[PDB]
Structure formats: C-alpha cells, structure tokens
Amino acid sequence: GPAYNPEMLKKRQLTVLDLHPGAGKTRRILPQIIKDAIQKRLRTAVLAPTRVVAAEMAEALRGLPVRYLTPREHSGNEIVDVMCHATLTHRLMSPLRVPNYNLFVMDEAHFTDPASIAARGYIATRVEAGEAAAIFMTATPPGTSDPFPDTNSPVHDVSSEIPDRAWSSGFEWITDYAGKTVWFVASVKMSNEIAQCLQRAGKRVIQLNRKSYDTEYPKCKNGDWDFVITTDISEMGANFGASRVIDCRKSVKPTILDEGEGRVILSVPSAITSASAAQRRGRVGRNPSQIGDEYHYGGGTSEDDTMLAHWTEAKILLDNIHLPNGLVAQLYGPERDKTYTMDGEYRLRGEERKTFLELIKTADLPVWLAYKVASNGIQYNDRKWCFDGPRSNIILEDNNEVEKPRWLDARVYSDHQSLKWFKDFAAGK
Numbered sequence: 001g002p003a004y005n006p007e008m009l010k011k012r013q014l015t016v017l018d019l020h021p022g023a024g025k026t027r028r029i030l031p032q033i034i035k036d037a038i039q040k041r042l043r044t045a046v047l048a049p050t051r052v053v054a055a056e057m058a059e060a061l062r063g064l065p066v067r068y069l070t071p072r073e074h075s076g077n078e079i080v081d082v083m084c085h086a087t088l089t090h091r092l093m094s095p096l097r098v099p100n101y102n103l104f105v106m107d108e109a110h111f112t113d114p115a116s117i118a119a120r121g122y123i124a125t126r127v128e129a130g131e132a133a134a135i136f137m138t139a140t141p142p143g144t145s146d147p148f149p150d151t152n153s154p155v156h157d158v159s160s161e162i163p164d165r166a167w168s169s170g171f172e173w174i175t176d177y178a179g180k181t182v183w184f185v186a187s188v189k190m191s192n193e194i195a196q197c198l199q200r201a202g203k204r205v206i207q208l209n210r211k212s213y214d215t216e217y218p219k220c221k222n223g224d225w226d227f228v229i230t231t232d233i234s235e236m237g238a239n240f241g242a243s244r245v246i247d248c249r250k251s252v253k254p255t256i257l258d259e260g261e262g263r264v265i266l267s268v269p270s271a272i273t274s275a276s277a278a279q280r281r282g283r284v285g286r287n288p289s290q291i292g293d294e295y296h297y298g299g300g301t302s303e304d305d306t307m308l309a310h311w312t313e314a315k316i317l318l319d320n321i322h323l324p325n326g327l328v329a330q331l332y333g334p335e336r337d338k339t340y341t342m343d344g345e346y347r348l349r350g351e352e353r354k355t356f357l358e359l360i361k362t363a364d365l366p367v368w369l370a371y372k373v374a375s376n377g378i379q380y381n382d383r384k385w386c387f388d389g390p391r392s393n394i395i396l397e398d399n400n401e402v403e404k405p406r407w408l409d410a411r412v413y414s415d416h417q418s419l420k421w422f423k424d425f426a427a428g429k
Helices: 025-039 051-060 085-092 114-128 172-176 188-200 213-220 274-281 309-318 350-361 367-374 416-426
Strands: 014-017 044-048 066-068 080-084 103-107 133-137 155-159 181-184 205-208 227-230 244-247 254-257 263-266 293-297
Touching (some): 025 044, 051 066, 051 080, 051 213, 114 309, 188 227, 188 416, 244 274, 274 293
Parallel strands (some): 014 133, 044 080, 181 244
Antiparallel strands (some): 254 263
16 A cells, blocks of 8 residues: 555554565664654554564664563653563553553554454554554555565465475475475474474474574574474564475464363364465565575465454453443454454453463463463462363373363464473473
C-alpha cells in the first residue's frame, strides 16, 4: 500500500505498511515514525516479534529517548517504549499499570503466536474506540495471496520433492549444493531428524525454533554453517546470508479437541498459507548484488487455518486483559472470523489469572494447558495434576514410559527439547 505518512499517527488510524527487505524499515522508516511520534508527544509502544528484533530496534533508535522493556538504563521521562509483542500482552494480563499508549507500532505483524494475535486485538480495539493509532508492519498483510512476490533480486522458483525424514540415497541436489541453505521444516521433530541426517553427511547445521532462536540465531551471522534447519519462527524477520531456501511448504498445527476434558493434538504436516510461503521464500532474493538465489517448494498452499489452536488461545489471553472504561476486546478485524465463542468465556478471577499468567510467562506452558491448570484452581507450584490424570494420558518417550497428566497438550512431549523441559517442569526445574 501507500508510504508512511504522519496522518497515520492520528487516533482511529490503523494502517498496514507493506514493507519489504532492502529499503528501509528498521533503519529508516521506523526511526522516522518514532521521530514523528515524539514530535507530536505521542505515548508509543513499539512491538518486536522477538528479543532479537527488539535489540535490532535498539540499535536503529540510538539517539532517541526510548525505554527498552526487554532483558540498560533510562531517564524515566521517555514516552516511547520498545518491547516484544508478548510483553505487552503479558503486562495487560497483570494488575500492574499499563501506560495509556496513543500509538502502537507492531513489527512483523503477521506473527500468529497467540500473544501476538491477542496484542493485535487489544490494539485494534483501542484504535476503533478512538483512543489510539496503530501501524502494523509486514511483508504479508491481511489478504495476501501471492507466494511468489517480486523481490530485490531474482529468485529461481523450483518445484521439488523435499524430504520429510532422513534419507540414505537420492536428493543429491540437496547435499551437493556448494552454498548456504535455509530449510523450513514442519516441526522441531522433523528439524532434529533432518539436521542429524545432514550432520552425518558432514554438513554444519544450526537448528532454529521458538526455544533455540535467541541463542542459536545470533550464531548465523558468523557464516560458519551449511544449513539452517528452521521452523516457522524464522518467518519473523530472520536475515540469513543464504542463497537457497528449501521449503517443505508444510507445518504441524496444534488443534484443540473438545472432546470431554479436552486435549491438544499436533496435526500431521499440512499445507501452509500463501502468506507463510511468501515469508519463507523471502529469506532470499534480498540482495541485488547476489544473483542465482533459489527457492525450492515441496507442495501447494492452503488458506484455511481456522483449526489452529492459536486463534482460541489468543482469545483466552484476550478475555484476561482488563480494559479501562467498559471496552470489550475483539480480535483484529481480519482475524475475527477464524473462530469465536461467547465474549468473556475464558475470563478468570484474580488469583487464577495470576497463576495463569505465571504458567504461560514463567513455566512456558502452552496457553491452553496453562488455562486448563489455572481454570481448575490449581496453584502454580502444585504439580499433582501432572501425575493423577487418566490412564490414557500416560506419556511415552520411545514408547517407554518415563517418570499423568490431567490434560494432554501434544506440544509439551512431541520432541526431545520440549519433553526434557516438561519433565523438568514436573519437578522442579
């Protein structure tokens, strides 16, 4: 759409800026937005998808009075705050006072993390009510349908069969490749299997996922790698010095079955959206001086993601954000129809909401599972629910078992990193 203009900072304005690699979002557009906001004395929240991007913003906004609310001194007089999407949501769910932001600027606003969706709903609600302006920045705005957008440098788009598991023959084109490859896989479990196969083939491999990103992504800069094997987390602003993307064009989707008690299952890998495909491809084609970038895609796209648990989880989060003067939160317009129940259905009382926030924010439990635990009067430190569940809920590692739980969320035991964490949570830590 149109280019950033100060009109966009006025109350009731919500603008999606379709801003692409190259010129000049973090180092030129964002700084100008913030300069204009300060000039108009607007109380501003700048929202990054990840701590990594929040640090990059800090670099870009040097010389402006900006407070960084992510883990470092401040005057206490700054009116621009930089944080993660989830930090805003998490703050809004606590009784601690949230400033009356006049302007929200959300980077990588396509992020479908539940707390990102919830943030957008809160923001859109405040804007619609005339209390704020919002700018959402993304290369894939609502209604994106093109998996193959124009780029800064040409990309060779190639339909290719992509392994979903280890292989012992064939796929020579994968391993013969002399440059750097970013390979989007459907899951962490797939990541581990693909990565180990490539390592046995002598390749230097970095694995990026939600958990590993903060520590592992900074290692990419050094160039000491052949493959980055990544989940969808790299769709939120990752910049690789790569010449090839491999994209299985799939993702495992969590889904809530409900279904007596409820559980969350992980779908078999299924087609991603056209917007997601464009974001995966968009890791390459960025540098006009680098020709011959390749994008290999292993399947089609599908726009129906209404079964994603994140949509319900977003409104569980949103039902637990107290709004000043009678305002009832709805999801951001383009995201409203994905699901919907009775408004306020997931709203919790004080002590339960506090337990809920701590389960999600400190224990890193999925929002649904944290909600199940909190909604049943369980105290944060009371792990008894992890052991006194039905028989069917026994958890197995290599079909064992190991040492439950009252409720099953497949996201806590479907890979090595996650099960290792959930077992520790069962303690402990």
